[PDB]
Design a protein around this ligand. Sequence first.
Ligand code: FES
Ligand code: FES
Ligand SMILES: [Cl-]
Ligand SMILES: [Cl-]
Ligand code: NA
Ligand code: NA
Lengths: 109, 109
Amino acid sequence: MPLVTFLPHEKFCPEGLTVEVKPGTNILELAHDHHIEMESACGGVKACTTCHCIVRKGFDSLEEADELEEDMLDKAWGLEAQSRLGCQVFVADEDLTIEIPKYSLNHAA
Amino acid sequence: MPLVTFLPHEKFCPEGLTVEVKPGTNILELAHDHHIEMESACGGVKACTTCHCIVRKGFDSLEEADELEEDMLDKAWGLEAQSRLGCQVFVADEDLTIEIPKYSLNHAA
Ligand code: FES
Ligand code: FES
Ligand SMILES: [Cl-]
Ligand SMILES: [Cl-]
Ligand code: NA
Ligand code: NA
């Protein structure tokens, strides 16, 4: 059973979180299940950047981002080679380590 | 009568805004009066960074930031010499030009 690790984040998960999950688990859904309140402005349909995360371990196990996701990621703060939209990340067969970025696009409540 | 200029921002004010205002006008209040929906998470009491702005013209006309404001600004994305918390900016006797930052601390809705 793959482990997902959320790295510590001052706002969303100060102590971090490590959890065993089934293959096919959605990262955004998992975060919300554990009250890691990652924003999901567009409702998880690859139309914002608020669920931006960086998959620092296990990125290469994941299904490749589609064009819609890649186009949104081009707009994100702090884009990296392992950036993903959290709403589109589904755990496969390997452990993942997820960093939630410190910064994001400034937007209205 | 001083002019306040908000520089164009993709999310908050795509075309920018220039308005004549009375001395003593609060920048956050003014922005909201013109549906420039700058976030004000703490309710305008110098306890967050969501109203962060950069006063690119007229900064030196303003009352100096107090210690509470300076301590919050130390936490803001993209801190500059002319950074202020918008909720604490009151127009004095000179025109102001205000830039709303592109990025901010990533936080929950
Ligand atoms: S919640 Fe908008 S792209 Fe993920
Ligand atoms: S609204 Fe929180 S410091 Fe200005
Ligand atoms: Cl972003
Ligand atoms: Cl900020
Ligand atoms: Na904001
Ligand atoms: Na956010």
